[PDB]
């Protein structure tokens, strides 16, 4: 249920470290 | 290059605030 | 390459320090300096832009997946 | 479909010899699930190589 | 680099989780990666010794 | 008995205190939010539309970009004048030369030097400190004074016999010094300039009075800029690219508010009379008593 | 042990000022000090590396 | 601390004239040197709209937008541009505390009620206190405005910092 | 009910698009 918003929160800092 | 510096700084901090928003959105 | 000098015959100098010093470094120093000058000599941003387009293309799928709750 | 990017991130990107298949390697399947979720960094493939090397290191622990 | 690392949020590193972007950023000077074991004063003294 | 505002302002205190930053992330300073400010009671509204912040970013980009595009204007001015003469620059600076010396390498060093100067320009450079006194009011007044002064007719013998007498000795230039073998440029050089009596070429000196001797060093290169905004670019041997700096491609008000010499208001420590000897600055002390 | 791989070597600069006693002379004296990160103190030249 | 009360009272006094809300700021070793702080004469500020380049010039553009014509006599617009620039800046109240302190503890030495959500013990070597005023044109204020800041020393030099006003009001104005 | 969160998230992303 609430795991998916936390997984999105992991993926955006994942994309940040891919980017910057 | 200074505009790129301030742009990546603002992008980085703004996505960090978005992550702070969405992490406290699922209580 | 070589300069065109106005005064034809050349002239000696007393080499005063109050006179401006005259280019005393010989050609081996210029060889060393050309070696030093030889040895001392984006799209990823729009890539990350369109990759953020791919992330929001996934995010609209997550938006469609979350409306049934 | 999916097979062309999987054969990229196994053979083209990861440079694996093909006789290490899927069925010999389960944590490889647990890693290609997230390797395909990103599209950049396929030039510095050695980072992916040592990532799977440290992953097979941390999985093969008694603890 | 050009600015000192006073914002403490550019200092994080995990172990055993397959952190693939920090391994591709091993030459990136601006992000710092520490293994969150902050040194106390006496072992700081011993290391300085 | 009405409570004076200082008492409940004292007992009111602060809601919160946080730090902020500048645009370029160079300065961190802290704001204070008193609960008893009338800004709390003014209930004022707030909105931040995206095209407005985009216009703010473009205005800030131009306000940063003014001196850098001035530097670019100087650089392609150099390029246009070296294309103009064909590439055979004359000598303007007094220093002897040697015929038996290969000038191809000092030409290559000049190319590398102007390259390294383009990589290492600055908002604090030679031409900015040159044109900052031009922005003053006395600059316009003395410009009128010189334009009537040098353009004054030859005097009749009557004022030679009975009229009062007449009086521009040496110039105050600024310079960039680019050193290629150490890859270090220089931005602020104050230099005195004069003319030789025997020849019309220039002689540069320290602001103390010492003769500047870098022109003998072959690896170095220099850029001179004058208070009337002329332009020299001297590789060793005294040969000089000579032009003027172009600024018609820049707006007046952006250059006028981005940097400008400042005229002072009267505060504690200075004379009401103009041009008197100044006494000691106030200089509040962290070492003595406040008294 | 490769699961703790770390990062490349960095040269950090410490810009700490002094304590409050020695700050009373030259208070705007910054103090720079270069340290190493993920590096190794060595005593010889490793041949095969 | 003492300029904050007076500047609050004065910006409440002049609020009918310019509609500037006050902004109390403190600065430390992280911005300026102690030698720059021990003899700092005064501070200037100017509120610049995202589209309007000043508040001292005319609002709907200005005649100084025509470019400088490389003229000898009037260099850049003559002296009219100069005293327009003297009009576009404003002075602020100003104090310097050179000995080090901690504003939590120091504002507890003064009689205020320091009521913060958490006591982050922040230490600084020299605390300079000022208060600027940023201009909402009507009652409504825009976040894309910016506020400049000059620091002027007795030699005549200055340091220039500016920042856009939304960054001051990220969590403060959205709280209301 | 998750239309508002993803919708203001997408408008935030479009605000990011005006920054690069």
XYZ file of C-alpha atoms in Angstrom:
764
model
C 0.000 0.000 0.000
C 2.241 2.784 1.297
C 5.419 1.131 -0.027
C 5.049 2.613 -3.507
C 5.376 6.273 -2.469
C 8.545 5.387 -0.562
C 9.837 3.529 -3.637
C 9.176 6.664 -5.706
C 11.126 8.600 -3.060
C 14.011 6.160 -3.546
C 13.884 6.410 -7.335
C 13.991 10.205 -7.485
C 17.225 10.384 -5.472
C 18.390 7.475 -7.629
C 17.780 9.684 -10.681
C 19.485 12.565 -8.859
C 22.636 10.517 -8.334
C 22.399 9.439 -11.967
C 22.148 13.129 -12.860
C 24.162 15.028 -10.251
C 28.166 28.316 -16.622
C 27.013 30.263 -13.558
C 23.440 29.865 -14.782
C 24.051 26.126 -15.085
C 25.493 26.119 -11.552
C 22.464 27.843 -10.026
C 20.152 25.714 -12.195
C 21.539 22.352 -11.063
C 21.597 23.651 -7.484
C 17.931 24.641 -7.641
C 16.986 21.384 -9.383
C 18.811 19.307 -6.759
C 17.306 21.109 -3.773
C 13.832 21.207 -5.342
C 13.743 17.474 -6.021
C 14.960 16.958 -2.453
C 12.023 19.036 -1.191
C 9.732 17.005 -3.460
C 11.077 13.805 -1.916
C 10.523 15.269 1.543
C 6.964 16.099 0.462
C 6.129 12.679 -0.999
C 7.786 10.708 1.826
C 5.602 12.500 4.380
C 2.619 12.160 2.019
C 2.164 8.414 2.661
C 2.203 9.127 6.481
C 58.015 35.502 -39.178
C 61.033 37.739 -38.728
C 60.262 41.375 -38.031
C 60.851 44.326 -40.333
C 63.054 46.725 -38.385
C 63.113 50.425 -39.210
C 66.746 50.958 -38.226
C 68.950 48.965 -40.587
C 72.208 48.721 -38.706
C 71.928 47.260 -35.193
C 73.063 48.980 -32.013
C 74.761 47.860 -28.797
C 73.369 48.472 -25.305
C 74.878 49.353 -21.929
C 72.289 46.995 -20.329
C 70.897 49.283 -17.696
C 68.223 47.844 -15.398
C 66.547 51.234 -15.801
C 66.586 50.405 -19.489
C 63.973 47.795 -20.347
C 65.679 44.412 -20.578
C 66.049 42.976 -24.045
C 64.704 39.460 -24.716
C 67.792 37.696 -23.408
C 66.381 34.162 -23.446
C 68.062 32.123 -26.211
C 66.523 29.586 -28.555
C 66.852 26.524 -26.303
C 64.706 28.290 -23.708
C 62.176 28.960 -26.461
C 62.330 25.254 -27.365
C 61.602 24.391 -23.738
C 58.762 26.919 -23.708
C 57.194 25.545 -26.891
C 57.374 22.118 -25.260
C 55.620 23.574 -22.197
C 52.961 25.207 -24.375
C 52.425 21.919 -26.206
C 52.143 19.864 -23.028
C 49.850 22.270 -21.127
C 47.064 22.251 -23.739
C 26.241 19.642 -23.021
C 24.310 16.854 -24.725
C 24.260 14.972 -21.406
C 22.033 17.741 -20.010
C 19.352 17.263 -22.667
C 19.918 13.520 -22.215
C 18.943 13.906 -18.564
C 16.072 16.189 -19.623
C 14.558 13.562 -21.922
C 15.296 10.919 -19.295
C 13.167 12.938 -16.880
C 10.557 12.816 -19.653
C 10.855 9.019 -19.434
C 10.489 9.203 -15.640
C 7.266 11.186 -15.949
C 6.100 8.789 -18.667
C 6.420 6.127 -15.989
C 4.824 8.482 -13.456
C 1.624 8.857 -15.475
C 1.407 5.048 -15.407
C 1.773 5.207 -11.621
C -0.931 7.901 -11.648
C -3.278 5.618 -13.591
C -2.428 2.732 -11.248
C -3.240 4.721 -8.089
C -6.741 6.024 -8.876
C -8.537 2.814 -7.846
C -7.599 3.297 -4.181
C 9.619 -5.646 -26.560
C 12.006 -6.511 -23.703
C 14.555 -8.991 -25.105
C 16.743 -6.523 -27.031
C 17.547 -4.404 -23.979
C 18.074 -7.516 -21.837
C 20.561 -8.869 -24.380
C 22.119 -5.410 -24.328
C 22.490 -5.345 -20.525
C 23.757 -8.949 -20.530
C 25.937 -9.183 -23.640
C 26.408 -5.702 -25.113
C 26.574 -3.617 -21.932
C 27.661 -6.164 -19.335
C 30.014 -8.103 -21.712
C 29.079 -11.410 -20.134
C 30.038 -14.687 -21.793
C 26.684 -16.204 -22.673
C 27.209 -19.606 -21.010
C 26.437 -17.925 -17.695
C 22.720 -18.082 -18.446
C 19.807 -16.990 -16.281
C 19.260 -20.389 -14.633
C 22.831 -20.470 -13.287
C 22.434 -17.094 -11.613
C 19.361 -15.882 -9.656
C 20.795 -12.678 -8.226
C 21.611 -11.724 -11.813
C 17.845 -11.749 -12.367
C 17.385 -9.673 -9.234
C 19.884 -7.145 -10.646
C 18.735 -6.961 -14.296
C 15.296 -6.037 -12.969
C 16.753 -2.727 -11.776
C 19.517 -2.344 -14.376
C 16.874 -1.994 -17.078
C 14.963 0.634 -15.061
C 17.614 3.225 -15.977
C 18.885 4.151 -19.429
C 22.095 6.124 -18.873
C 25.544 4.990 -17.641
C 25.883 2.286 -20.295
C 29.248 3.694 -21.377
C 30.933 3.076 -18.006
C 29.961 -0.578 -17.999
C 32.758 -1.418 -15.540
C 30.666 0.170 -12.783
C 27.901 -2.320 -13.583
C 30.498 -5.098 -13.707
C 31.916 -4.372 -10.267
C 28.372 -3.769 -8.987
C 27.380 -7.318 -9.869
C 30.760 -8.497 -8.548
C 30.131 -6.916 -5.150
C 26.584 -8.288 -5.301
C 27.754 -11.857 -5.866
C 30.263 -11.157 -3.091
C 27.612 -10.058 -0.587
C 25.225 -12.873 -1.528
C 27.901 -15.553 -1.070
C 28.337 -14.914 2.654
C 27.526 -17.377 5.412
C 26.195 -14.425 7.428
C 35.428 21.756 -4.772
C 34.503 25.447 -5.213
C 32.093 25.555 -2.263
C 32.788 23.766 1.022
C 30.523 20.877 1.945
C 28.621 22.559 4.770
C 25.206 21.209 3.667
C 25.394 17.814 5.338
C 23.082 16.132 2.803
C 25.829 15.479 0.234
C 27.447 12.925 2.569
C 25.809 9.497 2.359
C 26.853 5.995 1.315
C 25.294 2.551 1.752
C 27.014 -0.847 1.705
C 25.655 -4.137 0.396
C 22.626 -2.590 -1.341
C 24.044 -2.434 -4.925
C 24.221 1.348 -5.014
C 24.926 1.500 -8.760
C 24.861 5.349 -9.248
C 27.589 6.072 -6.689
C 29.773 3.453 -8.373
C 29.339 5.291 -11.645
C 30.087 8.524 -9.785
C 33.382 7.359 -8.270
C 35.163 10.192 -10.106
C 32.508 12.781 -9.214
C 34.205 15.201 -6.848
C 31.144 17.032 -5.522
C 29.150 14.164 -3.898
C 30.868 12.751 -0.828
C 30.335 9.180 0.340
C 31.152 8.216 3.925
C 30.398 4.979 5.758
C 28.550 6.781 8.617
C 30.951 5.781 11.407
C 31.904 9.154 12.823
C 35.277 9.171 14.540
C 35.324 10.164 18.199
C 37.980 12.302 19.847
C 40.451 9.754 21.200
C 40.804 7.764 17.987
C 41.089 11.112 16.209
C 44.032 11.802 18.523
C 45.522 8.376 17.812
C 45.126 8.826 14.052
C 46.751 12.257 14.270
C 49.576 10.636 16.232
C -1.853 52.734 31.622
C -1.051 51.735 28.049
C 1.693 49.165 27.601
C 4.546 50.667 25.609
C 5.400 48.731 22.461
C 8.902 47.783 23.627
C 7.547 45.738 26.556
C 5.233 43.392 24.679
C 7.693 43.415 21.791
C 10.287 42.131 24.252
C 7.890 39.564 25.691
C 6.744 38.653 22.189
C 10.070 37.271 21.033
C 10.761 35.345 17.847
C 8.652 32.749 16.073
C 11.458 31.191 14.053
C 14.933 31.866 12.713
C 16.397 30.335 9.580
C 19.244 30.843 7.153
C 18.987 31.798 3.496
C 21.383 31.955 0.560
C 22.274 34.251 -2.302
C 21.791 33.250 -5.923
C 25.325 31.992 -6.545
C 25.511 30.078 -3.202
C 28.313 32.206 -1.787
C 26.628 33.914 1.183
C 24.621 32.403 4.015
C 22.908 34.785 6.428
C 20.060 34.404 8.884
C 16.652 36.054 8.957
C 14.715 36.846 12.130
C 10.917 36.624 12.413
C 9.468 38.571 15.324
C 5.863 37.706 16.119
C 5.104 41.331 16.988
C 5.970 42.827 13.615
C 3.135 44.596 11.820
C 3.953 42.410 8.800
C 2.134 39.682 10.734
C -0.900 41.955 11.031
C -0.799 43.183 7.430
C -2.235 39.811 6.142
C -0.623 40.524 2.768
C -1.070 38.135 -0.127
C 1.568 36.196 -2.015
C 1.913 34.479 -5.375
C 4.759 33.108 -7.499
C 3.919 32.452 -11.135
C 6.428 30.562 -13.220
C 6.868 32.982 -16.115
C 7.552 35.726 -13.568
C 10.390 33.720 -12.032
C 11.576 32.909 -15.551
C 11.725 36.637 -16.332
C 13.604 37.086 -13.052
C 16.128 34.456 -14.129
C 16.647 36.039 -17.548
C 17.094 39.485 -15.988
C 19.608 38.050 -13.526
C 21.354 36.269 -16.402
C 21.774 39.556 -18.275
C 22.891 41.333 -15.088
C 25.583 38.701 -14.654
C 26.370 38.538 -18.368
C 27.145 42.250 -18.930
C 30.883 42.192 -18.163
C 31.411 38.765 -19.722
C 29.932 39.830 -23.041
C 32.024 42.986 -22.718
C 35.064 40.689 -22.471
C 33.802 38.796 -25.529
C 33.411 42.127 -27.336
C 37.030 42.909 -26.498
C 38.137 39.482 -27.747
C 36.483 39.627 -31.129
C 37.609 43.251 -31.374
C 41.144 41.813 -31.160
C 40.185 39.186 -33.729
C 38.718 41.772 -36.100
C 41.714 44.072 -35.866
C 44.188 41.231 -36.424
C 42.100 40.286 -39.444
C 42.052 43.958 -40.443
C 45.779 44.660 -40.712
C 46.494 41.216 -42.143
C 48.381 40.193 -39.006
C 51.481 42.432 -39.068
C 51.211 44.414 -35.869
C 53.562 47.369 -35.281
C 55.461 48.409 -32.156
C 54.091 50.908 -29.657
C 56.214 50.144 -26.585
C 59.842 51.063 -25.986
C 61.998 47.946 -25.692
C 64.801 46.744 -27.926
C 64.576 43.546 -29.975
C 66.865 40.918 -31.489
C 66.696 39.911 -35.141
C 68.304 36.487 -34.585
C 65.368 35.103 -32.615
C 62.446 33.011 -33.847
C 59.215 34.970 -33.428
C 57.003 32.003 -34.341
C 57.164 30.661 -30.806
C 56.327 33.985 -29.183
C 53.453 34.281 -31.670
C 52.258 30.830 -30.549
C 52.664 31.945 -26.937
C 50.553 35.013 -27.746
C 47.802 32.771 -29.139
C 47.955 30.527 -26.068
C 48.019 33.595 -23.815
C 44.896 35.191 -25.276
C 43.256 31.764 -25.060
C 44.125 31.478 -21.349
C 42.892 35.026 -20.786
C 39.556 34.100 -22.347
C 39.368 31.099 -20.020
C 40.229 33.249 -16.996
C 38.341 36.519 -17.342
C 36.699 38.132 -14.335
C 34.149 40.736 -13.282
C 37.152 42.338 -11.556
C 39.504 42.777 -14.506
C 41.626 45.513 -16.043
C 38.959 47.120 -18.213
C 36.364 47.163 -15.425
C 38.704 49.067 -13.119
C 39.558 51.231 -16.127
C 35.987 52.247 -16.881
C 34.738 52.484 -13.286
C 36.166 56.039 -12.855
C 34.570 56.878 -16.207
C 31.138 56.413 -14.634
C 31.643 59.335 -12.248
C 30.239 62.843 -12.601
C 33.723 64.361 -12.584
C 34.544 62.144 -15.549
C 31.926 63.984 -17.616
C 33.053 67.361 -16.258
C 36.724 66.681 -17.012
C 35.734 65.286 -20.409
C 34.165 68.645 -21.231
C 37.238 70.359 -19.759
C 39.625 68.355 -21.929
C 37.444 68.779 -25.016
C 37.656 72.535 -24.619
C 41.279 72.270 -23.476
C 43.048 70.338 -26.237
C 40.767 71.878 -28.877
C 41.820 75.424 -28.001
C 43.195 77.758 -30.673
C 46.756 79.047 -30.848
C 47.143 82.093 -28.592
C 47.716 85.635 -29.788
C 50.736 87.542 -28.404
C 48.454 89.768 -26.295
C 47.682 87.057 -23.756
C 51.310 85.980 -24.101
C 52.224 89.471 -22.912
C 49.487 90.161 -20.365
C 47.092 87.226 -19.993
C 47.464 84.600 -17.275
C 49.454 81.524 -18.117
C 48.544 77.977 -19.120
C 49.355 74.596 -17.601
C 48.471 65.858 -18.567
C 51.866 64.475 -17.547
C 51.520 60.697 -17.216
C 48.695 58.200 -17.524
C 47.162 55.739 -15.071
C 46.540 52.479 -16.926
C 45.282 49.072 -15.892
C 46.529 45.756 -17.120
C 46.007 42.023 -17.349
C 49.184 39.943 -17.134
C 48.801 36.428 -18.523
C 51.632 34.028 -17.670
C 51.455 30.949 -19.864
C 54.230 28.790 -18.383
C 52.537 28.877 -14.979
C 48.963 29.172 -16.379
C 48.284 32.105 -14.043
C 46.651 35.252 -15.340
C 46.447 38.590 -13.584
C 43.331 40.739 -13.345
C 44.067 43.921 -11.448
C 47.308 45.595 -12.489
C 47.704 49.272 -11.700
C 50.460 50.735 -13.870
C 51.798 54.210 -14.612
C 52.407 55.027 -18.265
C 54.498 57.677 -19.986
C 56.166 58.528 -23.283
C 59.881 58.521 -23.997
C 61.468 61.868 -24.900
C 63.479 60.405 -27.770
C 60.722 58.285 -29.323
C 56.952 58.251 -29.101
C 56.764 54.752 -27.634
C 55.366 53.952 -24.221
C 57.132 53.225 -20.938
C 55.305 51.412 -18.144
C 56.199 51.630 -14.470
C 55.027 50.524 -11.040
C 52.687 52.786 -9.076
C 55.549 53.233 -6.622
C 57.895 54.206 -9.459
C 59.719 50.970 -10.221
C 60.188 50.094 -13.888
C 57.919 47.243 -14.943
C 60.156 44.547 -16.383
C 57.815 41.771 -17.525
C 58.069 42.764 -21.205
C 61.478 41.087 -21.465
C 60.041 37.727 -20.388
C 58.976 35.946 -23.598
C 56.455 33.531 -22.087
C 54.257 36.272 -20.617
C 51.782 38.589 -22.330
C 49.964 41.727 -21.273
C 46.821 43.757 -21.977
C 46.752 47.496 -21.282
C 43.639 49.645 -20.990
C 43.608 53.436 -20.592
C 41.326 55.831 -18.659
C 39.952 57.137 -21.970
C 39.197 53.468 -22.791
C 41.762 52.804 -25.474
C 43.192 49.333 -25.849
C 46.618 47.745 -26.202
C 47.600 44.083 -26.260
C 51.358 43.623 -26.036
C 53.228 40.412 -26.659
C 56.968 40.595 -25.809
C 59.006 42.817 -28.069
C 56.767 45.825 -27.463
C 54.532 45.058 -30.440
C 50.954 45.950 -29.656
C 47.516 45.199 -30.964
C 45.920 48.641 -30.721
C 42.192 49.383 -30.778
C 39.310 50.777 -28.742
C 36.904 48.861 -26.538
C 33.388 48.574 -27.950
C 30.431 48.808 -25.593
C 27.562 49.982 -27.841
C 26.182 46.436 -27.714
C 25.484 46.874 -23.994
C 22.611 48.739 -22.395
C 23.258 51.914 -20.436
C 21.295 51.178 -17.280
C 22.553 47.599 -16.838
C 26.173 48.735 -16.894
C 25.216 51.714 -14.755
C 23.640 49.720 -11.910
C 25.719 46.535 -12.125
C 28.912 48.322 -11.136
C 29.517 52.011 -10.552
C 31.887 54.145 -8.525
C 30.132 55.371 -5.407
C 29.880 58.878 -3.999
C 29.803 58.936 -0.223
C 27.305 60.415 2.186
C 28.461 62.198 5.313
C 28.746 59.988 8.378
C 30.770 60.018 11.571
C 34.465 60.633 11.040
C 34.584 62.718 7.855
C 34.769 66.447 7.248
C 31.819 68.553 6.197
C 34.365 70.484 4.157
C 35.201 68.689 0.933
C 38.713 67.412 0.341
C 40.007 67.914 3.871
C 42.381 65.454 5.536
C 40.367 62.588 6.935
C 40.843 61.598 10.588
C 40.805 58.027 11.844
C 37.917 55.710 10.934
C 35.481 54.817 13.764
C 36.608 51.151 13.829
C 34.443 49.471 16.459
C 36.746 47.173 18.376
C 36.547 43.546 19.358
C 39.782 44.095 21.274
C 39.141 47.214 23.365
C 36.188 48.355 25.423
C 33.164 49.727 23.549
C 33.026 52.923 25.722
C 35.378 -8.315 1.054
C 34.738 -6.519 -2.274
C 31.173 -5.663 -1.148
C 32.715 -2.670 0.665
C 34.379 -1.106 -2.357
C 34.319 2.569 -1.413
C 35.311 5.273 -3.862
C 38.335 6.766 -5.569
C 40.909 8.841 -3.749
C 40.102 12.454 -3.004
C 42.220 15.335 -1.780
C 40.187 17.287 0.734
C 40.986 20.755 2.033
C 40.242 21.651 5.650
C 39.529 25.363 6.041
C 39.082 25.500 9.799
C 40.138 28.642 11.666
C 41.852 28.453 15.004
C 40.494 28.329 18.516
C 39.214 31.503 20.133
C 42.499 32.150 21.936
C 44.732 32.168 18.865
C 41.991 33.897 16.860
C 42.564 37.026 18.965
C 45.577 37.702 16.755
C 44.767 37.779 13.032
C 41.040 36.963 13.322
C 40.614 36.636 9.567
C 43.389 34.072 9.304
C 41.851 31.100 7.574
C 43.884 27.897 7.819
C 44.016 25.428 4.942
C 45.199 21.862 5.408
C 45.168 19.168 2.736
C 44.188 15.626 3.719
C 43.592 12.424 1.770
C 40.453 10.309 1.494
C 40.342 6.594 0.566
C 44.097 6.839 0.011
C 46.980 4.725 1.231
C 50.193 5.717 2.934
C 52.872 3.708 1.157
C 56.524 3.003 1.821
C 57.568 1.587 -1.560
C 56.560 1.592 -5.196
C 54.084 -1.250 -5.871
C 55.453 -2.863 -9.007
C 52.465 -4.718 -10.438
C 49.947 -1.913 -9.805
C 19.184 43.737 18.269
C 18.513 47.384 18.813
C 18.037 48.329 15.168
C 15.335 45.677 14.810
C 12.843 47.445 17.084
C 13.542 50.858 15.557
C 13.380 49.562 11.991
C 10.125 47.726 12.704
C 8.713 50.966 14.110
C 10.032 53.035 11.202
C 8.763 50.700 8.499
C 5.439 50.739 10.307
C 5.730 54.528 10.205
C 6.470 54.799 6.487
C 4.256 51.920 5.330
C 1.752 54.305 3.752
C 4.519 55.802 1.619
C 6.482 52.934 0.073
C 4.678 49.741 1.259
C 7.936 48.069 2.309
C 7.799 45.258 4.776
C 10.782 45.067 7.137
C 13.260 42.212 7.114
C 15.601 41.732 10.068
C 18.877 40.066 9.104
C 21.977 38.936 10.967
C 25.303 38.043 9.404
C 28.418 36.281 10.602
C 31.888 35.118 9.571
C 30.346 33.114 6.715
C 29.780 36.260 4.610
C 32.320 38.935 5.555
C 35.695 39.153 7.225
C 36.220 40.457 10.746
C 38.416 43.206 9.314
C 35.530 43.914 6.959
C 33.144 43.821 9.931
C 35.093 45.906 12.431
C 35.052 48.976 10.164
C 31.977 48.420 7.992
C 30.466 51.854 7.382
C 27.001 51.136 6.051
C 24.737 48.837 4.078
C 22.524 49.542 1.088
C 19.596 47.674 -0.378
C 17.338 47.921 -3.397
C 14.251 45.885 -4.238
C 14.175 44.872 -7.903
C 11.064 43.480 -9.567
C 11.362 40.413 -11.813
C 10.479 42.742 -14.709
C 11.030 46.211 -13.223
C 14.704 46.968 -12.843
C 14.342 49.276 -9.820
C 11.928 51.166 -7.622
C 13.697 54.514 -8.011
C 13.357 54.771 -11.765
C 10.122 55.042 -13.707
C 7.975 51.879 -13.490
C 7.093 51.481 -17.161
C 10.647 51.296 -18.438
C 13.181 54.098 -18.521
C 15.066 56.247 -21.018
C 18.348 54.665 -19.869
C 17.551 51.521 -21.862
C 19.056 53.132 -24.950
C 22.647 51.865 -25.165
C 25.792 53.747 -24.257
C 27.168 55.269 -27.443
C 30.906 55.190 -26.487
C 30.852 58.948 -26.071
C 33.686 60.928 -24.527
C 31.714 63.871 -23.101
C 28.808 62.161 -21.359
C 30.262 58.733 -20.611
C 27.206 56.717 -19.591
C 24.114 58.917 -19.700
C 25.893 61.796 -17.989
C 25.299 62.548 -14.340
C 21.567 61.881 -14.635
C 22.241 58.148 -14.641
C 24.503 58.716 -11.641
C 22.020 60.455 -9.371
C 19.309 58.097 -10.597
C 21.563 55.348 -9.257
C 21.984 57.334 -6.062
C 18.189 57.399 -5.874
C 17.821 53.681 -6.588
C 19.702 52.674 -3.423
C 18.494 53.032 0.150
C 20.259 52.943 3.505
C 19.353 50.586 6.338
C 19.885 50.601 10.081
C 22.984 48.860 11.246
C 24.921 47.545 14.276
C 27.995 45.388 14.820
C 28.762 43.117 17.770
C 32.416 42.151 17.287
C 32.892 39.792 20.216
C 31.532 36.283 19.564
C 28.170 35.108 20.832
C 25.284 32.711 20.211
C 22.016 34.352 19.184
C 19.934 31.842 21.125
C 21.969 32.538 24.255
C 22.620 36.199 23.396
C 18.961 36.904 22.705
C 18.326 35.231 26.044
C 20.720 37.728 27.676
C 18.551 40.466 26.274
C 15.034 40.278 27.618
C 13.418 38.580 24.617
C 11.525 35.302 24.752
C 13.550 33.056 22.464
C 10.877 30.558 21.434
C 12.309 28.295 18.747
C 11.044 24.862 17.718
C 14.453 23.319 18.466
C 17.619 24.770 19.982
C 20.132 24.446 17.174
C 23.174 25.869 18.940
C 24.594 28.183 16.274
C 27.833 29.994 17.108
C 29.339 32.975 15.325
C 32.453 35.068 15.745
C 30.962 38.508 15.054
C 27.292 39.346 14.614
C 26.267 42.238 12.387
C 22.604 43.227 12.675
C 20.597 45.067 10.042
C 17.078 45.314 8.673
C 16.145 45.872 5.044
C 12.720 46.509 3.601
C 11.359 44.671 0.584
C 8.666 46.456 -1.382
C 5.348 44.842 -2.057
C 3.928 47.338 -4.609
C 0.342 46.969 -3.499
C -0.576 44.758 -0.536
C 0.100 41.790 -2.841
C 3.731 40.647 -3.060
C 5.410 38.528 -5.733
C 7.944 35.839 -4.930
C 10.053 36.448 -8.004
C 11.248 39.824 -6.742
C 14.888 40.088 -5.739
C 16.632 42.146 -3.090
C 20.162 43.470 -3.478
C 22.622 44.254 -0.718
C 25.664 46.531 -0.797
C 28.214 46.568 2.006
C 30.266 49.779 1.972
C 33.575 50.340 3.831
C 35.371 53.700 4.404
C 37.854 53.128 1.583
C 34.952 53.298 -0.882
C 34.855 49.639 -1.888
C 31.684 47.592 -1.707
C 30.461 44.021 -1.795
C 27.328 43.074 -3.718
C 25.011 40.207 -2.804
C 21.496 39.714 -4.128
C 18.891 36.993 -3.780
C 15.350 36.487 -4.975
C 12.665 36.938 -2.365
C 11.013 33.532 -2.752
C 14.081 31.891 -1.191
C 13.505 34.004 1.904
C 9.853 32.927 1.921
C 9.863 29.218 0.971
C 8.383 27.891 4.219
C 7.546 31.188 5.912
C 4.932 32.508 3.505
C 3.398 29.123 2.715
C 2.883 28.667 6.463
C 0.313 31.490 6.465
C -8.120 10.525 -4.691
C -4.582 10.045 -6.012
C -5.378 12.341 -8.937
C -4.577 15.488 -6.943
C -1.166 14.291 -5.709
C 0.069 13.088 -9.104
C -1.517 16.147 -10.740
C 0.302 18.694 -8.574
C 3.367 16.459 -8.996
C 3.101 16.774 -12.788
C 2.595 20.537 -12.526
C 5.711 20.603 -10.331
C 7.496 18.713 -13.132
C 6.277 21.291 -15.634
C 7.635 23.957 -13.289
C 10.931 22.058 -13.447
C 10.670 22.223 -17.246
C 10.815 26.013 -17.006
C 14.155 25.649 -15.185
C 16.074 23.609 -17.769
